[PDB]
Amino acid sequence: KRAIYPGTFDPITNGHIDIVTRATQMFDHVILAIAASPSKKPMFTLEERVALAQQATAHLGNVEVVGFSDLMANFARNQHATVLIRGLRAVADFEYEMQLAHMNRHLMPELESVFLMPSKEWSFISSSLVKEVARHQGDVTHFLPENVHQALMAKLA
Amino acid sequence: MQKRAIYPGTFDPITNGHIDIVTRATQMFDHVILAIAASPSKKPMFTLEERVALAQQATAHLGNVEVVGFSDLMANFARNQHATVLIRGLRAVADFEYEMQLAHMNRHLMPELESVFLMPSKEWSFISSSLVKEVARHQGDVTHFLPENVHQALMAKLAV
Amino acid sequence: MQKRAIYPGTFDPITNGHIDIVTRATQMFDHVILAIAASPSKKPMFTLEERVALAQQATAHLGNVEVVGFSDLMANFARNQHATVLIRGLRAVADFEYEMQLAHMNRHLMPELESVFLMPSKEWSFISSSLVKEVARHQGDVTHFLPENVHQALMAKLAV
Amino acid sequence: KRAIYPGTFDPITNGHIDIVTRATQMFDHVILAIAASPSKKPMFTLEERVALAQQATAHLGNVEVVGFSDLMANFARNQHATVLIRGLRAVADFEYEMQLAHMNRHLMPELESVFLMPSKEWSFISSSLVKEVARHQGDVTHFLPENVHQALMAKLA
Amino acid sequence: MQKRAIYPGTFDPITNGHIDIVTRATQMFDHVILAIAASPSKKPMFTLEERVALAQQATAHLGNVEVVGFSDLMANFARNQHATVLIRGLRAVADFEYEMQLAHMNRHLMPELESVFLMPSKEWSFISSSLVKEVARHQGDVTHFLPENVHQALMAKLAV
Amino acid sequence: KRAIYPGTFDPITNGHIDIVTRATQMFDHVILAIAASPSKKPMFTLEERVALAQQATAHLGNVEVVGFSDLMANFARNQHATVLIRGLRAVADFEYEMQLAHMNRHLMPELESVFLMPSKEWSFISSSLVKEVARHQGDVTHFLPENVHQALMAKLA
Ligand SMILES: COC(=O)N1CCC(Oc2cccc([C@@H](CC#N)Nc3nc4n(n3)C(=O)CC(C)=N4)c2)CC1
Ligand SMILES: COC(=O)N1CCC(Oc2cccc([C@@H](CC#N)Nc3nc4n(n3)C(=O)CC(C)=N4)c2)CC1
Ligand SMILES: COC(=O)N1CCC(Oc2cccc([C@@H](CC#N)Nc3nc4n(n3)C(=O)CC(C)=N4)c2)CC1
Ligand SMILES: COC(=O)N1CCC(Oc2cccc([C@@H](CC#N)Nc3nc4n(n3)C(=O)CC(C)=N4)c2)CC1
Numbered sequence: 024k025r026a027i028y029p030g031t032f033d034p035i036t037n038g039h040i041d042i043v044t045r046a047t048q049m050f051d052h053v054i055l056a057i058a059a060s061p062s063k064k065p066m067f068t069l070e071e072r073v074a075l076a077q078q079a080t081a082h083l084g085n086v087e088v089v090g091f092s093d094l095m096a097n098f099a100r101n102q103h104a105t106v107l108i109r110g111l112r113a114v115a116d117f118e119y120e121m122q123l124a125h126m127n128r129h130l131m132p133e134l135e136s137v138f139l140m141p142s143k144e145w146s147f148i149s150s151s152l153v154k155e156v157a158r159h160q161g162d163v164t165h166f167l168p169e170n171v172h173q174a175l176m177a178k179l180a
Numbered sequence: 181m182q183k184r185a186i187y188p189g190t191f192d193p194i195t196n197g198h199i200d201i202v203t204r205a206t207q208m209f210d211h212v213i214l215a216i217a218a219s220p221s222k223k224p225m226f227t228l229e230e231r232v233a234l235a236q237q238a239t240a241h242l243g244n245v246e247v248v249g250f251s252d253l254m255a256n257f258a259r260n261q262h263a264t265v266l267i268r269g270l271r272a273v274a275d276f277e278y279e280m281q282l283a284h285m286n287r288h289l290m291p292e293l294e295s296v297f298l299m300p301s302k303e304w305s306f307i308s309s310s311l312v313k314e315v316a317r318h319q320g321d322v323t324h325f326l327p328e329n330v331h332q333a334l335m336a337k338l339a340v
Numbered sequence: 341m342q343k344r345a346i347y348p349g350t351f352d353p354i355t356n357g358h359i360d361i362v363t364r365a366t367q368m369f370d371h372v373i374l375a376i377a378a379s380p381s382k383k384p385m386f387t388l389e390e391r392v393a394l395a396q397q398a399t400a401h402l403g404n405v406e407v408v409g410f411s412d413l414m415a416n417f418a419r420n421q422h423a424t425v426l427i428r429g430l431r432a433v434a435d436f437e438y439e440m441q442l443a444h445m446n447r448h449l450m451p452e453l454e455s456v457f458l459m460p461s462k463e464w465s466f467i468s469s470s471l472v473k474e475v476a477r478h479q480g481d482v483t484h485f486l487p488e489n490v491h492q493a494l495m496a497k498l499a500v
Numbered sequence: 501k502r503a504i505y506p507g508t509f510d511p512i513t514n515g516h517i518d519i520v521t522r523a524t525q526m527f528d529h530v531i532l533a534i535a536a537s538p539s540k541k542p543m544f545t546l547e548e549r550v551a552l553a554q555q556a557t558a559h560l561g562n563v564e565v566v567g568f569s570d571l572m573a574n575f576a577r578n579q580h581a582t583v584l585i586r587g588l589r590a591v592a593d594f595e596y597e598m599q600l601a602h603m604n605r606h607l608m609p610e611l612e613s614v615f616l617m618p619s620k621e622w623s624f625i626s627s628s629l630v631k632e633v634a635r636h637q638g639d640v641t642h643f644l645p646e647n648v649h650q651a652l653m654a655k656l657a
Numbered sequence: 658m659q660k661r662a663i664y665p666g667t668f669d670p671i672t673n674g675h676i677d678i679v680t681r682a683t684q685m686f687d688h689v690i691l692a693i694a695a696s697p698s699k700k701p702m703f704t705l706e707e708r709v710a711l712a713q714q715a716t717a718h719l720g721n722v723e724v725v726g727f728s729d730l731m732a733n734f735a736r737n738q739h740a741t742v743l744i745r746g747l748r749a750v751a752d753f754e755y756e757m758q759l760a761h762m763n764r765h766l767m768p769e770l771e772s773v774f775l776m777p778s779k780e781w782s783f784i785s786s787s788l789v790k791e792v793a794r795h796q797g798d799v800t801h802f803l804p805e806n807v808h809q810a811l812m813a814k815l816a817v
Numbered sequence: 818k819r820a821i822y823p824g825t826f827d828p829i830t831n832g833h834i835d836i837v838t839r840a841t842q843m844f845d846h847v848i849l850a851i852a853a854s855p856s857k858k859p860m861f862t863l864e865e866r867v868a869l870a871q872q873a874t875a876h877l878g879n880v881e882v883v884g885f886s887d888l889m890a891n892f893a894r895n896q897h898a899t900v901l902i903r904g905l906r907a908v909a910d911f912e913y914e915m916q917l918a919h920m921n922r923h924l925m926p927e928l929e930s931v932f933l934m935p936s937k938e939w940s941f942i943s944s945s946l947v948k949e950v951a952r953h954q955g956d957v958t959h960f961l962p963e964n965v966h967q968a969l970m971a972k973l974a
């Protein structure tokens with residue numbers, strides 16, 4: 024059973040670590056898939072985001088970190104994945120996830136969208152919120168893996 | 181991994197929305213327990229025996245579904261059944277809010293039970309057993325939203 | 341086009357929020373049926389006869405409003421009345437969710453009945469008949485939210 | 501009875517066709533009004549969006565497609581429209597529509613905002629979602645009128 | 658400014674979520690009235706005397722909290738108590754919608770009473786007295802969500 | 818008791834005047850704090866926004882208008898404020914406010930986030946909505962203090 028956990032992960036947070044960890048306890052192999060997403064002008068390049076997520080998930084033996092520029096549904100089919108993992112946060116996210124899931128069901132009917140709920144600890148966090156706090160020199164050590172926190176400080180320095 | 185998943189609810193009666201969710205669950209987990217609550221807060225339209233018999237007949241074509249009644253705390257029953265995945269459907273915002281509140285409570289009760297939310301077909305996202313019962317009680321056509329055996333049982337129930 | 345619109349509900353009692361919606365509906369459709377549900381799920385504070393009489397007096401200044409009681413499925417009554425437009429007010433998110441679920445059900449029941457959502461004045465967006473009744477029962481001033489005849493009937497009802 | 505159905509329609513989808521069709525069954529004349537909206541940098545020019553919507557609604561005899569750069573409420577008054585049609589989709593849209601409706605009621609009290617619900621078939625779709633799928637080469641033929649699907653493929657080619 | 662704030666509710670029973678909110682309120686206002694509704698719509702699990710005694714013992718460490726029962730309209734009681742601040746907790750969207758509707762009503766009833774919304778710790782955002790009671794009734798562990806005296810009273814109540 | 822009311826206030830509206838007035842009836846001293854926010858490309862410079870808010874709140878004796886580029890929580894600590902005022906509007910805002918409040922509680926546990934509800938009169942308005950109406954020449958005199966309405970007309974002229 025293969026699952027894909029896609030997103031921009033700019034950068035990967037403890038919220039994302041929590042969701043991917045939960046996914047590895049349910050599925051034999053989890054592909055953490057990072058969207059190149061040039062249109063959103065990410066803070067970190069695709070190569071940097073992949074390296075950070077690789078280092079942050081190295082302790083999980085059944086996680087594979089990959090980058091993609093393809094249509095989500097085509098990438099999932101090409102990874103032989105039948106499960107798509109997304110974390111639920113707020114109503115805006117939930118409504119957007121429902122749009123993506125109905126669209127993905129039209130593109131790949133056998134790809135099942137599965138929603139996980141992160142720990143209360145990471146419910147309110149996002150990569151954007153952590154970057155905004157960090158841009159104004161606020162302490163974000165609690166919200167990120169060690170390697171990511173160092174890379175974020177270095178990027179803003 | 182040989183995963184055991186639980187899909188709990190009152191299923192009063194089981195609808196095509198429930199069939200959709202349980203079918204999706206059987207496609208990703210080895211064994212699915214469709215768990216029927218014995219004693220809901222409000223008296224159900226269908227007795228537990230009727231709910232269990234309707235759900236069994238409506239899921240008989242799914243080889244890895246087991247329909248079982250339960251009266252314990254859902255998490256206590258899931259633990260006893262060795263289920264490590266809890267399945268719930270999410271139709272709209274109202275569901276999202278309530279299901280998130282239940283998921284945090286269940287994680288406190290049974291941390292090893294993972295809550296997994298699936299989304300039903302657009303065809304069933306606006307239906308619930310309550311809405312179907314209300315429409316049928318008030319003389320509206322609900323045939324499209326139910327398995328045939330449930331449509332037959334509901335007509336018989338409303339006729340008396 | 342000579343459109344017939346239906347504005348259904350329990351109207352227990354009719355409030356200034358309902359007056360606002362029905363007034364807007366009369367400005368866009370030739371004939372509006374303000375349809376009162378005979379037998380709601382919970383016993384209403386006002387009997388059907390009181391609800392109909394209050395609604396008639398409160399809308400008497402609107403020439404193209406007809407107040408009528410109904411006990412059938414709302415869509416069955418709309419079809420029988422030759423109404424092709426169903427009017428509902430949308431106050432907040434809770435309304436939006438429930439009304440969308442009802443609209444999909446009604447489209448299945450009567451595809452030729454179009455659901456049209458109107459938004460009340462900011463003055464009435466936070467009120468409901470239930471909230472007005474709860475405030476008045478607990479000795480709060482609700483005069484501003486009701487037509488004069490309803491204010492009189494509610495005071496008489498609570499006095500006994 | 502004249503109704504106006506405004507929006508950016510960049511490009512017009514089957515969701516928009518469904519709403520305008522429902523509007524023509526209720527009102528004698530429907531103006532489908534396209535906002536020039538240069539600030540949002542549309543994919544299609546105003547002239548292209550008007551031509552696409554004209555072709556896609558040609559089978560509906562009581563639809564008139566026009567472009568506008570004016571304040572919505574002023575344009576509606578100048579079209580002798582007393583009804584404003586909007587389709588409801590998600591909570592974010594509904595909350596935004598409520599803000600526009602209260603603002604429009606202050607600018608033109610006699611302009612009644614009317615909300616329609618699209619078919620379940622088009623509930624999750626938007627022009628942005630269709631463009632995003634198409635930008636990554638996903639099949640969007642189901643979601644658009646034929647002429648629009650050809651114009652979108654051509655624009656991205 | 659010597660502000661008097663009111664924190665009203667049914668508190669059936671008082672939870673750690675309520676303790677969190679009242680503690681935050683005591684940190685910003687000179688005096689806080691934790692106001693307990695005498696006669697809720699549905700019969701409470703705990704009598705008013707039990708709710709008041711539990712709330713008093715659970716807030717005894719807060720020097721500027723006064724626990725009082727009330728049966729009037731909340732705004733009428735707040736006016737009589739010279740409270741100018743009304744405290745309510747906001748956990749999620751469902752709360753936000755209902756609390757906004759209540760706040761507009763209270764502003765109409767008592768314009769000089771300002772509604773102030775506080776947000777509880779992440780630890781209690783998914784809990785309510787109703788959810789705690791439902792979990793405990795169905796044999797689930799709720800010790801973490803309650804003050805010790807409430808945990809003791811709830812176990813005694815469910816045992817009989 | 819000192820409270821801080823932060824935001825971008827680009828420009829300050831009657832919705833903001835209503836919230837700050839309510840705040841001054843509850844707290845001895847209210848700091849209305851304007852975020853420099855260059856990343857959002859505000860219509861008005863920080864100096865213009867501060868001058869407008871100063872003039873619009875001059876009739877309230879216990880309001881101090883200041884600009885800031887710092888992390889919110891650090892600015893509040895440095896102002897000796899223990900209360901943070903935010904107005905509630907829509908679900909999107911409420912969900913975003915909950916994220917900020919949990920983040921601020923991690924950065925400054927003693928800073929209590931307090932939410933006020935504006936008058937029904939200003940519930941649907943925002944600085945963005947007023948600017949959008951004004952950009953298309955719609956009458957926004959009802960929604961802004963006199964000095965702000967003049968400055969907005971002048972800026973767009
Ligand atoms: C259920 O999950 C998803 O459906 N996702 C896809 C969107 C998003 O990840 C991105 C973000 C930016 C760009 C991309 C690009 C690849 C690059 N570069 N592919 C892509 N495929 C899509 N896209 N975009 C959509 O916008 C909508 C859709 C149904 N399919 C993905 C989250 C994951
Ligand atoms: C995530 O799902 C859920 O959390 N479930 C449980 C609630 C509900 O199924 C019911 C309905 C009625 C009664 C019951 C009874 C058994 C009987 N008879 N057990 C039960 N277990 C609970 N209960 N009640 C709650 O009230 C809350 C909670 C967290 N756990 C279950 C849906 C499934
Ligand atoms: C879009 O509006 C609605 O859908 N309406 C119908 C529900 C409600 O008005 C009531 C209330 C109580 C009872 C009734 C009774 C008549 C009596 N007595 N008919 C009725 N028709 C229904 N009903 N119930 C439902 O429960 C659901 C549904 C889709 N159609 C109507 C609001 C209007
Ligand atoms: C109820 O509908 C609406 O109220 N609408 C207006 C907004 C939107 O269509 C646009 C989009 C971009 C720009 C425009 C421009 C024209 C161009 N170019 N006119 C315009 N008039 C407005 N605008 N913007 C607002 O932002 C708010 C408001 C109350 N009135 C319209 C949807 C329709």
Ligand SMILES: COC(=O)N1CCC(Oc2cccc([C@@H](CC#N)Nc3nc4n(n3)C(=O)CC(C)=N4)c2)CC1
Nearest residue numbers: 474478665666694695696697727728729730731759762
């Ligand atoms: C903003 O808070 C609130 O608005 N409150 C009031 C409601 C509720 O506390 C109750 C619960 C049950 C009964 C009561 C009784 C007293 C007894 N017994 N008074 C009361 N006052 C009200 N009531 N009911 C309403 O139904 C609506 C309203 C605006 N004001 C209060 C929460 C606090």
Ligand SMILES: COC(=O)N1CCC(Oc2cccc([C@@H](CC#N)Nc3nc4n(n3)C(=O)CC(C)=N4)c2)CC1
Nearest residue numbers: 155159823824852853854885886887888889917920921
């Ligand atoms: C509860 O309120 C808030 O928490 N606020 C902060 C965000 C927002 O005001 C801004 C807007 C733009 C930029 C800024 C800059 C200063 C400049 N320039 N400081 C800042 N501090 C933050 N920021 N951003 C975040 O994005 C998130 C966060 C928890 N703290 C503030 C509203 C107030």
